[PDB]
Every structure is written in structure tokens, then in C-alpha cells.
Write a protein that binds this DNA or RNA. Structure first.
Ligand SMILES: Nc1ncnc2c1ncn2[C@@H]1O[C@H](COP(=O)(O)OP(=O)(O)O)[C@@H](O)[C@H]1O
Ligand SMILES: Nc1ncnc2c1ncn2[C@@H]1O[C@H](COP(=O)(O)OP(=O)(O)O)[C@@H](O)[C@H]1O
Ligand SMILES: Nc1ncnc2c1ncn2[C@@H]1O[C@H](COP(=O)(O)OP(=O)(O)O)[C@@H](O)[C@H]1O
Lengths: 406, 338, 601
DNA sequence: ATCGATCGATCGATTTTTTTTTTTTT
DNA sequence: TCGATCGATCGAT
């Protein structure tokens, strides 16, 4: 789908990889296969077949996949020595912050927390109950924000990503499906976008006009690893361990002077409940920020690189390993601050409770604040979650709401 | 038959039974550690101790079952869906769909084609699988109007009769309801009683036994106790057998065994108090667009009475039960004094 | 051969029942005596009697059944031949019974064949008669084709060699549809049992078969007690193949007890018009002559109830007769009529009728808002199963010659109700949009269950504005008799001391004077009488109606009159007598005036 | 020497299904 | 590639 003709459609071909190369490919590897074309005789009915038309097929021996395989991706990221020279070479976090989609300026606090989405890394089996560590947030308000840009970019950089929209796929396009099998013909189940994006992030855009029953379909992932279908309607069991990158638009208007949440938006409020961070992006006129971005994005076009001579934004390739190394720590929790994390939840639930009818403030916040400070410490790789560690998370959720005060 | 016990367990069972503390011990011991609003689970034990059987092999009349239904309703922050997913991991005949989980037809008559016979079939329902059991229900006020005139049939006749182009059916089904309704908002509005808030008629709202009102603890003070204790819960990752002695499974037979060998009966006890005070209890003619007391209450009251007389295993009726029954009722029957 | 032992055994069984079978009496020849004229080829047998006299042929019968089975037809033939001038037309239908053991679908394996075990379930997706010329005549083509052979085999096979000649054995003679064997069956499926309700798996489906005389006395919605004669049934089965083949499972059964769907109409063992229609003359003579019978009847069905004593004297109306007279082809003349109830919140509005459905037969009750608007019509379908539009039923019309009342009469949409606006008098209903020029007929009465507007009876407005609906309907309901609420302690203490004798488990009700069964049978005797009108009231009802409307000279007219003469002809049916009298008039007039002045403000 | 049974070379006969776009009614 | 067709052939009689 890069060299297809200008007015054509993607084609395909079949493989018969023989010998000792079975299990030398996976769904989603831009492979490079080297073998021999051959013809094929599908013996049978002498009229449709037997027409001397040569329904060919392929043969090969060697599968050197040059894109996203054992060759170009090492560790087939944990290799410590080769990265140490650059590891001590730099010591900062925001340097890894704005290196994500670095072609505009603005929305700094969104990108870092998004980077938290790629790592995560909080896994355990405490009391038999498993805790999901995949953040799922949305994007709200779109009178021009580049909503589809972060999604389309990070779905590329994020290994094993996907992307769909409202009427770009039915419910079976998201969930499993069925098809005959050239291997056996078992009529097995093949899944949709969310069926395969587990252990990663499946991106969705313009959530509201997705579908009506689809909201239950996304209500189900909040009890993770649970994709229950009624296709055959027997069990339809499936283990999806995906995050979710939500993003949708407001209806006619953007927070009318009398309107409130669930009034200006027409999404299921129960669905709105099951998120950890809500994210609305509203841009009112700023008489001197517009010129800033105008000079920001216009330099995307005269050349092909934004950040000049102010910081050294990192290559994507080194990003790929630098994110993977942080994951393997799995620290403990500091009891010495457990006495105060609850007080932080006290001020959290109170300074929003001081008014009668502000937007909802949920009891799952204490189950959420613990899940972010861990992944944030993952990039410390230290098991040293500190008092100032959550000091960013407190302002993070602090501004996640009260986005209309001024 | 596959659960009949030995007599040795009767020792520990009746040993638990012998103390008035049992009314509070199990109410405390349902939850893992949730130590707030224990005032309600003491009524939920009346459905866990799943009601009485005034059997009707006598004359065939009136089918007055010990029909018990009680519901909870409040904010979504309270752990209703969570508590009841745990209750799914308590009740034997656990069902769990919910408001806009499946329609009336989504609860009855899953009629469709099957490639196994490869022929069209008259087929299954959902409620009727849980005869005498429970179905935990959530988020009630999203269901279609076709449904919720189905439940009128069961709750007020305790029957079912079905007729489509295929079969006409007169099956049997009966059970006790639980559900966890929510409003169209985040919070119940003050100065707007439940008499109109949630989406139901002018007198079918109160037509359930008693809706034990629930709401977020509107108090910052309580937050620290749970934010400490129930995170240390995770942080230690095991339990402790404190004064409310959790029996690993020996508690569960006091629930199990106590459906079968009991037949609550009334001598003189749980009739006479309201039979005396009926004048001021039934001056209910006053009110502008209200709802209040009607002469059905004592049916539900005898139900709750012989229920709480089942616990303590009093084969004859309990007289103390009447007191906490009155408590149960007037705990929430003037939430609209206005 | 195996079954000669069964031959001798049922031979001496015959030889015993050839004499008496029970105390110098016979129970298994008089079925054959009734058989002797038409020769319908059935005689069921108790299996208990096999345990009585033949001394355990069960283990002789109950494992190698199928191979013994056909020998018992020859047994039946050897029975019937002993006394009647007999041809070999005799045949064996069987409807086995009186067997102790009653198992389920799950205890089924390859070792369960040739037995008589008993099973229940439910009836679904039933299928029709499907004949079978099971037999015929078939051999070579020269001359010698008269073949009474065994060609009835399941897998069917034309090829037969010969009897008399040496001839072709692949060229058949043609077939016989004239002087041969034909029989009748049908075929259904059955679902998992509701008397056996496990968890986990699906409702495993069974195939299942019935014989001729078994046919069309089953029906949808019924629980059963069948035979257990599982059988060898003549892709994906990729096991080993042999020859000197992949089967599925099937089943048949040849006995039915279609219980839980049985009443039987009306037949003191004495003389009467018919066998047992009113053989209780010994007491019905008294039940038709007592002078306080009216009140003794009134208080004979509501001992567990106390309220007004005015519909306890009326509502027998509904169950009581109409006219059933002999006239010309002028039009339908109608027999039964509406009634109405309105009341304050729960003065036992519903327990009047929750029981009445259990009281008389054929009259099942429920609501229609239990379902879609498919109360009147069947489920409107627009997908292809047979021909894409199938609406030939409903639920209201499932009460033909019986009643099907409603609750919540007010909150129902004005589609079923506007259809009711015609469906009660010109008792013939029609539709379009899926109708093969739909021509139905309902026939029956009704009972209403209204509820005021605000839930109170504040006399600030007329009744027609106390309900504030559409109007004309409130005439054809010929009696309302509303129940009122007040606030008085004496009544409510009387109610609570009704509950004093609801659970005091010994003598938890009051004494009575008339038992129910005698009442119902007297009622179902009282209709078939052909009433008569020759009375001066029949001459002098004109002034009664004229006086009625002298009171109405200050809604109106003769729908109420139609009612009037029918209310009173019913109250004379209650006198177990024809020949209308002039007092049932005066009572009916009083009931009329109660209704209207009850309507009056 | 006549005739029936079995073998074997000779002949001709079978192999099309899952979505969509209008349509009536709730 | 499967099936009956028909003609020929080998012992009996
Ligand atoms: N400050 C900015 N820097 C870079 N691109 C921007 C900026 N402002 C707007 N854009 C453009 O605005 C577009 C927004 O599209 P988007 O909001 O994703 O569509 P939707 O609202 O359907 O999600 C982006 O594709 C981007 O090219
Ligand atoms: N008293 C309490 N005990 C335990 N959990 C509570 C309590 N109050 C609030 N919660 C929180 O509520 C959540 C469960 O709510 P849930 O019943 O799922 O909401 P809903 O039923 O509206 O979907 C839990 O995550 C828990 O943190
Ligand atoms: N005279 C009476 N006799 C018997 N029961 C009565 C009488 N008056 C009132 N009741 C009680 O009133 C109750 C009415 O309930 P009901 O009207 O059936 O509820 P709903 O209005 O939901 O159908 C009955 O259960 C009955 O116990």
C-alpha cells in the first residue's frame, strides 16, 4: 500500500513456505521473502478448472523480514551496555517529553502523560485479583486542535497500534468475525481492530458517532481482558489487554453558557465515568499565541524539521528501546507517604466538593493515582517513588477538571 | 441431596445461632472489609436467608408467596455494581445482566434457529433459569418500555404464560429481585423526592417493599479511614480472623441448611401492634400528590417478620423481629416529610 | 430364535386373560370389544399387570424390546382371532403405561436400546402428518407378482428376486398403492426438561416420533410421560470405514400421558339427561329449590374476602348463561356481556380475578402490556421463515367461549382499545397490512380494571370526567359497581382478623355451607335448558323501560335494555328453570338503577 | 455337442451461494 | 472415476 498504482486496489499472493521455515512470519511484519515463483494445478472439474488458466502460487525458502522483525528489532528492549553510552549521555525527562510529535508547540502536559500510556508497567496478582495498568483517556472539544494528528502519529510510533473512526467499521469489524481457512477450513474466528491491539493501544477518533450499541462494546474493556460477543452467542471469550486512546467532538457548540457536561455532550455518562483522565481541548482567542503557532507550523513546510537550536529532540529509534527498558522495574509502594496519599485524596475530593453541582468526582481516583505514579517511576527505573513524584499527578488531575473557570 | 451435611456441623451451626450477636455478625461478615452502611446488609440477609415458604398445598387459593423484593438506589460512586459482582460470587444462582443489558425479549424467549437440529425451535429465557434464586441488576433506568411491564407480571402474579405463532406456554418461574437503579443525573436532587426523580409511576415507585436509600457519604471525614485501611488491605495482601470470626466455609452452611428444615409459624405475636395503632397509622387521607401507607404493608411485614424469625431458627415466630421490622420501615418511610 | 420364549409367555398371558384377568372381571377385552366393530388396531397394556401375574417379564421385555416388539403384534392377532371371525388385518398400536421408572435425556448411552423408559419435556416446532405407503408388491415382470412380503423396512428397497419363477432380480414389477399397507405418524422435536433444570449446557434437543393413534392428541405447551425405545437410525465422522457410514442419534416412543392440559367437561351415580352431566340430582334438586340459595351462593366463593356484597351477587353474571335461542338468519344474537371495575388503590381489585381464571376452565387471564401490541393480533413478522407474513393469532382471541380479563385498563394504547371499541359487540375483527382478508372471531365477555385519574374519588366532577377518556365505550359496559375507600377502623380490624384465620394453621378460615365442586357442576348444568319467555313481564317490560326513562327523562338507551332482559334471563337460569318470570325483572331493574345512580353525582 | 455362468473389455454420466437495496410498519 | 452392457469363454451336461 505504498507502491500500488494511482487508481488501483491492493492485491495479494499466496505463500507455501516449506522446509524448516514454518513459523517465520507474524501478522503485521513488513517481511522480505526470497524464493521461486511456480505454477499450480488445482486439479478438479475439467470445465471451470482445466481451462488452461494457471491459478499460480508462490514458493520460498528464506524469510528475512527487513521491517519490524528479529533483524531490525534487537532483543530477539532490555540490552543495557549498548545504550549506557547514551544513557548517562543525557539526564532529563521533558527532553523525552516534547520529542513526541515535535512539529508544533503547545499541549505539553498532554504528551508526557500520553507517554505514560506507552509504558505503564504496573502488574501484580494481589489477593488473586489482577489490576489493569492500561490508561484509557479521551479527547473532547475540537474547533481545530490537531486531534487526528497525535492519534495518527503515535499509532505509527507505538508498536502494534491501530486506527479507526465512527462509521469506518461495524461492530464485527471491531470484534471477531469468521472466514474459511485455507490451512484447514475450520471456519475459525478472526478479530477486529480491538481484538488484536492488546498489550498496546488501539486508537479511536470521533467516538460519539461511532455507534449506539458500540458504547457497551467499549464499556466492556473497562473490566479488562473481557471481550464478550454474541456472534455465535455461546461464550465468545477473548483476552484483550489493550489500552484505549479515545477522542471525539462536541455537538453544535462548545460548552454553551448554560450547558454542562452530559448536556452539551451526548455520550453515555456511565461511559464517561469509567475513564481515569478526561481530556477536553478548548482554545479561546489568544492574541499572541496564534502568531506563535503560525511561525511554528509554517516552518513545517519550508523544510522538514521543526525544533531548531533549542534542544536535541531524540530519534524515534532510540525512543523505542528507551521506553522498553523502563518497564521491567515493578517497584514497591512507599508506606511513608501512604499516610499522605490519602490526605492528597482528601484535598482532591474536598476542593471539588466545596461546590454543590460541579462535575462528578469519583471514588476510583485513589485506584487511579496509584497506577500512574508507578509507571512514572518506571522511567526512573529505581523503585524510589517520592513525595514529589505524585506532586505532578496532583496538578495533573487538578487541571484535568475545572477547565472552564477562566 | 448432594449437600446433605453430617450432624457434627450442627454443633458449630447452632453455636453461631445461640447468640443474639448473629444478627450483626453475618451482616458484618458479608463484605471483605467494607465497614460502612452495615445497617442495610442486615436486611439483605433476609434475602440471603431467602424468605419463607407458606406453601399452598392447602386449598389452591391466592398464591400468596413470601414474595420479597428490595432494591438499592443512589449515586454511581457507591460500590453497587462492585458489591453485586461480589454478590455474584456469593449467591448460588447468580445472574447478572442489568438495565440496558438485555430487553424483555432479551430476558425471555431467545427464539432463533440452530444448525444442530438445523430447524427452527421454540426456545429459552433468562429469568426462569433463576427460579427461587437471584439476579443482580444495575443501571435500571435505561430499559425499553416494552420491558418493565414484563416484571409487573412476575412481581404481582409470580407467573408466566407465553404465546407466539409457535408454542403457547405456561411455565413456572418465581424469584426475588435485586437491582441497583440510578437516576438521569449524577446526584439525587434535594427538594425533588424519589416520588418523581427516577422514571416510574406515581404509586408504583413505592410499590416495592422498601427502597433502602443510598448516596455518597457527603462527608470528607470518612475518606481517610478507608483510604488508609483498604489500601493497607492491599499492602499486606492477606486477612485476619478478628472478633467477627470469619468461618472459611462453615458459615456458608448456616445459609445452606436453613432453607429446608424450617417452617415459621405465628402464635400471637406479629399482628397486634398495628392492629391497635391503625387509626393514626391509617389517617393517610391527607396529602397533595403524595404516597404513603396502604393496607398491603402487613403482607410484606409478616414476610420480613417470619424471615427474621428464620434467623435464630425460631420455628415459632420471633417477637423481636417486629421491632427491627418497624425500624426497617420507618428508617426510610418519611424521607419526604417536606 | 430368541422371542419364542416371549411367544409362549404372552400365549399363557392370553390364556389367563382369556379367562378372567381381575376378580372374575376383564379390563383388556372390553377395549377389544369396542375395537371389534371398526378395528382401529390399538390396545394399551399396564406394565404393572406384567408384574402382577406373569412374574417379571420386565427383564424379559425391557432390554431386548425391539426384537420382541413385532412378536407381540402376532400375540395381539392370536388374541383377537380366538372369538371373532378374523382376517389378518389385525395390527398393533401400543400406548404402554404403568411403568415405575422415569429418567431424563442425560442417562443415554449406547447400552440403552430396546427399553421402555419414561421421559418428559416440552413441545416445540411440531410437524405435520406425513403418510407412508410402507408396503406394496414387487417382484419380476413375467406373471408371478403377488408379494405380501417384508418390504416395510426403514431403508426401503425395491429389489426382490422372485417367489415362484427363476427370472430377473434387477428388473422390478411396478408398485401397489391399492391393496397394501399404509400407516400414519408425525414428527417433532422436544427441548430440555423443566422438571429437570440443570445449569451449564444448552437445552439439548431430542428427536422423537409418535404413531398413528398417538397423532394429534399432543400439542405445543405440554409436559409428557413417554416410552424409551431408542433406536438405530437408518459428514465430520472421519472414523474408520468397513464393508464385507456415519450415523446420528434418533429416538421414537409409543405411549403418551399429555397431562397438565386436561379438564373434561361434565360427564351421585344416578339417572339423568346424560351419563354424568348432572347425575347429582340427589342434591341439585335441593340446589334449585332453596329460597336462600342466592345468598348461600354469594358467600360460597369469597370466604377469604370481605368488602362490598354487591358484586358478590352480580359477577356470577359473567360465568352465567345468556340466551342460546332458535331463530332465523337475521343476525347474531348475543349471550354474555361486559362488566367493569374501578376502585381506590388496592382494595383487592386484582384478587377478584387472579383466582377467577383458576375458577372456571377455558378462560385464561393476563395483561397484554406483558407483551407488545400483540394482545389482539399475533406477532407481526417481516422476515422469511415460510412466506414472510404470518399473523393468525394473538392473546385476546385465545379466549373463545371463555374470558380473558385485563389489568391496568387505562394506561393501554388506543390501538388494541380502539379495536375493542368494535370487537365486543359485532364480535368479528379484521385488519390489513398482512391479512389474507383477515376474518377472525372472538366471542366472549370481559372484566375491567380501571383506576381513577389522581387515584382518589373526589366528587368534584362527573364520572365521565372522573376518568376523562373517550366516551361511547362507557355504555356497552352494562354494570360498573365501583369499590370505595374510606377511613374507619372497624372494617380494617375485621380485615386483620381475617388474617387471624389465614395462618393460624388449624382452622385458618370460617365455616361454610356449600362446597365448590357441587356449585360449579350445578352452574355447568344450568346452561343446557333452552329457556322460555311467555310471561306478562315479557308483555309488561315496556312500562318498566318507560319508567326507567321517565327517570332518565330528567347517557341513554336501548343497549342497556338488551342488557336488561339478559341479566334477568341469566338470573332465571340461576333458578334452574325455563319459562321466564316477572321477579328476575325487578331484581335486574334494581341492579340497573344501582348502576346508574352509582354513576350519578 | 448344447447351454449357463463368470470375466472382463466397452460403453456412457457427474461436478453454482451470501449482501444488499428497496419496502412496510412499529 | 464410477456403473451396467454386452460379448466372449470354460465346465456341465
Ligand atoms: N498549532 C498547530 N500545529 C500543527 N498543526 C495544526 C495546528 N493547529 C491546527 N493544525 C492542523 O489542524 C488539523 C486538525 O485536524 P483534527 O482536529 O485532527 O480533525 P478532527 O477534529 O476531525 O479530529 C491537524 O491535521 C493539523 O494539521
Ligand atoms: N464504601 C465503599 N466501599 C468500597 N468501595 C467504594 C465505597 N464507596 C465507593 N467505592 C468505590 O466505588 C467503586 C465501585 O463502584 P460501582 O458499583 O462499580 O459503580 P457503578 O455501580 O455506578 O458502576 C469501587 O472502585 C470503589 O473504589
Ligand atoms: N375485603 C377484603 N378482603 C380481602 N382482602 C382485602 C380486602 N380489602 C383489601 N384487601 C387486601 O388488599 C390487597 C390488594 O392488592 P392488589 O389490589 O391485588 O394489588 P394491585 O393493586 O397491585 O393489584 C389484597 O392483597 C388484599 O390482601
Amino acid at each position: 500500500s505504498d507502491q500500488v498504482p494511482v487508481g488501483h486496489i491492493p492485491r495479494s499472493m499466496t505463500i507455501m513456505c516449506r522446509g524448516e521455515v514454518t513459523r517465520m512470519a507474524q501478522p503485521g511484519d513488513h517481511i522480505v521473502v526470497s524464493g521461486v515463483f511456480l505454477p499450480l494445478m488445482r486439479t478438479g472439474f475439467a470445465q471451470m478448472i482445466q481451462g488452461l488458466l494457471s491459478e499460480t502460487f508462490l514458493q520460498a525458502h528464506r524469510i528475512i523480514c527487513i521491517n519490524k522483525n528479529d533483524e531490525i528489532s534487537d532483543k530477539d528492549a532490555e540490552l543495557t551496555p549498548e545504550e549506557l553510552e547514551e544513557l548517562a549521555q543525557d539526564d532529563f525527562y521533558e527532553r523525552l517529553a516534547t520529542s513526541l510529535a515535535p512539529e508544533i508547540y503547545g499541549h505539553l502536559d498532554v504528551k508526557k502523560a500520553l507517554l505514560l500510556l506507552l509504558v505503564g508497567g504496573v502488574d501484580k496478582r494481589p489477593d488473586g485479583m489482577k489490576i489493569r495498568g492500561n490508561i484509557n483517556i479521551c479527547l473532547m472539544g475540537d474547533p481545530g486542535v490537531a486531534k487526528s494528528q497525535l492519534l495518527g502519529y503515535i499509532s505509527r510510533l507505538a508498536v502494534r497500534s491501530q486506527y479507526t473512526t465512527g462509521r469506518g467499521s461495524s461492530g464485527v469489524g471491531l470484534t471477531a468475525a469468521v472466514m474459511k481457512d485455507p490451512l484447514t477450513g475450520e471456519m475459525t474466528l478472526e478479530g477486529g481492530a480491538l481484538v488484536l491491539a492488546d498489550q498496546g493501544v488501539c486508537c479511536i477518533d470521533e467516538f460519539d458517532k461511532m455507534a449506539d450499541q458500540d458504547r457497551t462494546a467499549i464499556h466492556e474493556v473497562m473490566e479488562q481482558q473481557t471481550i464478550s460477543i454474541a456472534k455465535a452467542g455461546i461464550m465468545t471469550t477473548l483476552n484483550a489487554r489493550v489500552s484505549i486512546l479515545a477522542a471525539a467532538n462536541p455537538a453544535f457548540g462548545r460548552y454553551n453558557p448554560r450547558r454542562t457536561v452530559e448536556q452539551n455532550i451526548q455520550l453515555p455518562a456511565a461511559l464517561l465515568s469509567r475513564f481515569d483522565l478526561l481530556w477536553l481541548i478548548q482554545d479561546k482567542p489568544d492574541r499572541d499565541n496564534d502568531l506563535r503557532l503560525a511561525k511554528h507550523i509554517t516552518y513545517v513546510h519550508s523544510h522538514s524539521k521543526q525544533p531548531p537550536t533549542r534542544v536535541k529532540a531524540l530519534d524515534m529509534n532510540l525512543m523505542r528501546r528507551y521506553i522498553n527498558l523502563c518497564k521491567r522495574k515493578n517497584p514497591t509502594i512507599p508506606d511513608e507517604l501512604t499516610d499522605y496519599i490519602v490526605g492528597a485524596y482528601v484535598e482532591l475530593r474536598r476542593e471539588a466538593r466545596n461546590q454543590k453541582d460541579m462535575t462528578f468526582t469519583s471514588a476510583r481516583n485513589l485506584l487511579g493515582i496509584l497506577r500512574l505514579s508507578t509507571a512514572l517511576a518506571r522511567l526512573r527505573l529505581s523503585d524510589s517513588v517520592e513525595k514529589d513524584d505524585v506532586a505532578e499527578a496532583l496538578r495533573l488531575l487538578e487541571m484535568s477538571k475545572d477547565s472552564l473557570n477562566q | 441431596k448432594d449437600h446433605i451435611f453430617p450432624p457434627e456441623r450442627v454443633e458449630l451451626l447452632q453455636l453461631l445461632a445461640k447468640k443474639p450477636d448473629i444478627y450483626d455478625r453475618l451482616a458484618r461478615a458479608i463484605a471483605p472489609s467494607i465497614y460502612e452502611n452495615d445497617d442495610i446488609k442486615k436486611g439483605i440477609l433476609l434475602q440471603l436467608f431467602g424468605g419463607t415458604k407458606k406453601k399452598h398445598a392447602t386449598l389452591g387459593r391466592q398464591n400468596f408467596r413470601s414474595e420479597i423484593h428490595l432494591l438499592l438506589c443512589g449515586d454511581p460512586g457507591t460500590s453497587k455494581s462492585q458489591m453485586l459482582q461480589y454478590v455474584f460470587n456469593l449467591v448460588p444462582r447468580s445472574q447478572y445482566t442489568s438495565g440496558r443489558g438485555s430487553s424483555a425479549v432479551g430476558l425471555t424467549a431467545y427464539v432463533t434457529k440452530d444448525p444442530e437440529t438445523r430447524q427452527l425451535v421454540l426456545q429459552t429465557g433468562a429469568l426462569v433459569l433463576a427460579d427461587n434464586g437471584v439476579c443482580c441488576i444495575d443501571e435500571f433506568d435505561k430499559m425499553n418500555d416494552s420491558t418493565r411491564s414484563v416484571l409487573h407480571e412476575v412481581m404481582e402474579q409470580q407467573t408466566l404464560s407465553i404465546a407466539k405463532a409457535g408454542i403457547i406456554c405456561q411455565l413456572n418461574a418465581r424469584t426475588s429481585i435485586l437491582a441497583a437503579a440510578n437516576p438521569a443525573e449524577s446526584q439525587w436532587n434535594k427538594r425533588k423526592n424519589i416520588i418523581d426523580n427516577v422514571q416510574l409511576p406515581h404509586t408504583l415507585l413505592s410499590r416495592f417493599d422498601l427502597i433502602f436509600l443510598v448516596l455518597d457519604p457527603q462527608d470528607e471525614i470518612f475518606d481517610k479511614r478507608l483510604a488508609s485501611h483498604l489500601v493497607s488491605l492491599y499492602y499486606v495482601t492477606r486477612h485476619e480472623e478478628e472478633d467477627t470470626m470469619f468461618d472459611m466455609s462453615v458459615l456458608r452452611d448456616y445459609i445452606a441448611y436453613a432453607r429446608e428444615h424450617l417452617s415459621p409459624t405465628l402464635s400471637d405475636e406479629a399482628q397486634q401492634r398495628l392492629i391497635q395503632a391503625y387509626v393514626d397509622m391509617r389517617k393517610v387521607g391527607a396529602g397533595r400528590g403524595q404516597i404513603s401507607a396502604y393496607p398491603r404493608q402487613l403482607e410484606s411485614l409478616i414476610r420480613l417478620s417470619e424471615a427474621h424469625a428464620k434467623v435464630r431458627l425460631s420455628n415459632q415466630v420471633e417477637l423481636l423481629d417486629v421491632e427491627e421490622a418497624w425500624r426497617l420501615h420507618r428508617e426510610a418511610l418519611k424521607q419526604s416529610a417536606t | 430364535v430368541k422371542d419364542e420364549v416371549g411367544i409362549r409367555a404372552q400365549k399363557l398371558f392370553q390364556d389367563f386373560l382369556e379367562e378372567f384377568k381381575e376378580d372374575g372381571e376383564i379390563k383388556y377385552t372390553r377395549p377389544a370389544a369396542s375395537l371389534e366393530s371398526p378395528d382401529r388396531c390399538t390396545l394399551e397394556v399396564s406394565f404393572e399387570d406384567v408384574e402382577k401375574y406373569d412374574q417379571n417379564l420386565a427383564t424379559a421385555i425391557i432390554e431386548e424390546y425391539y426384537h420382541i416388539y413385532p412378536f407381540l403384534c402376532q400375540s395381539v392377532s392370536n388374541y383377537v382371532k380366538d372369538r371373532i371371525g378374523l382376517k389378518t388385518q389385525k395390527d398393533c398400536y401400543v400406548a404402554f403405561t404403568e411403568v415405575p421408572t422415569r429418567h431424563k435425556v442425560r442417562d443415554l448411552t449406547t447400552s440403552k436400546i430396546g427399553t421402555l423408559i419414561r421421559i418428559s419435556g416440552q413441545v416445540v416446532r411440531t410437524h405435520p402428518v406425513h403418510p407412508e405407503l410402507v408396503s406394496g408388491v414387487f417382484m419380476c415382470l413375467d406373471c408371478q407378482t403377488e408379494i405380501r412380503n417384508v418390504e416395510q423396512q426403514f431403508k426401503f428397497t425395491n429389489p426382490t428376486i422372485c417367489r415362484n419363477p427363476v427370472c430377473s432380480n434387477r428388473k422390478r414389477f411396478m408398485l401397489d398403492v391399492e391393496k397394501s399397507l399404509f400407516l400414519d405418524f408425525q414428527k417433532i422435536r422436544i427441548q430440555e426438561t423443566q422438571a429437570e433444570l440443570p445449569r451449564g449446557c444448552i437445552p439439548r434437543a431430542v428427536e422423537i416420533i409418535l404413531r398413528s393413534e398417538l397423532v394429534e392428541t399432543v400439542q405445543a405447551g405440554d409436559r409428557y410421560d413417554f416410552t424409551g425405545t431408542l433406536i438405530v437410525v437408518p459428514l465430520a465422522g472421519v472414523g474408520t470405514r468397513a464393508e464385507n457410514l456415519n450415523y446420528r442419534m434418533a429416538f421414537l416412543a409409543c405411549s403418551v400421558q399429555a397431562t397438565t392440559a386436561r379438564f373434561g367437561g361434565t360427564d351421585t351415580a344416578e339417572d339423568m339427561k346424560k351419563q354424568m352431566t348432572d347425575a347429582e340430582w340427589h342434591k341439585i334438586y335441593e340446589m334449585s329449590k332453596d329460597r336462600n340459595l342466592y345468598q348461600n351462593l354469594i358467600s360460597s366463593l369469597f370466604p377469604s374476602i370481605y368488602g362490598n356484597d354487591e358484586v358478590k351477587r352480580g359477577i356470577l353474571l359473567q360465568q352465567f348463561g345468556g340466551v342460546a335461542k332458535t331463530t332465523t338468519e337475521k343476525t347474531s344474537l348475543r349471550g354474555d356481556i361486559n362488566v367493569c371495575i374501578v376502585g381506590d388503590p388496592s382494595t383487592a381489585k386484582s384478587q377478584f380475578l387472579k383466582q377467577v381464571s383458576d375458577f372456571s376452565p377455558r378462560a385464561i387471564y393476563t395483561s397484554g402490556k406483558a407483551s407488545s401490541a400483540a394482545g389482539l393480533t399475533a406477532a407481526v413478522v417481516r422476515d422469511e421463515e415460510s412466506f414472510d407474513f404470518v399473523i393468525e393469532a394473538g392473546a385476546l382471541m385465545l379466549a373463545d367461549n371463555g374470558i380473558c380479563c385485563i389489568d391496568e385498563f387505562d394506561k393501554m394504547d388506543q390501538r388494541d382499545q380502539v379495536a375493542i371499541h368494535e370487537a365486543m359487540e359485532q364480535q368479528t375483527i379484521s385488519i390489513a397490512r398482512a391479512g389474507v382478508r383477515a376474518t377472525l372471531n372472538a366471542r366472549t365477555s370481559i372484566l375491567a380494571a380501571a383506576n381513577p385519574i389522581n387515584g382518589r374519588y373526589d366528587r368534584s366532577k362527573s364520572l365521565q370526567q372522573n376518568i376523562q377518556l373517550s366516551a361511547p365505550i362507557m355504555s356497552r359496559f352494562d354494570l360498573f359497581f365501583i369499590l370505595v375507600d374510606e377511613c374507619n377502623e372497624v372494617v380494617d380490624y375485621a380485615i386483620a382478623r381475617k388474617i387471624v384465620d389465614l395462618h393460624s394453621n388449624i382452622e385458618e378460615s370460617v365455616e361454610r355451607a356449600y362446597t365448590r365442586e357441587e356449585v360449579l357442576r350445578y352452574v355447568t348444568f344450568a346452561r343446557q335448558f333452552k329457556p322460555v319467555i311467555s310471561q306478562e313481564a315479557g308483555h309488561m317490560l315496556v312500562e318498566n323501560y318507560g319508567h326507567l326513562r321517565q327517570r332518565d327523562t330528567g347517557r341513554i338507551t336501548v343497549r342497556q335494555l338488551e342488557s336488561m332482559i339478559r341479566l334477568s334471563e341469566a338470573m332465571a337460569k340461576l333458578e334452574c328453570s325455563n319459562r321466564v318470570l316477572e321477579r328476575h325483572v325487578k331484581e335486574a331493574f334494581r341492579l340497573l338503577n344501582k348502576s346508574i345512580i352509582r354513576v350519578e353525582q
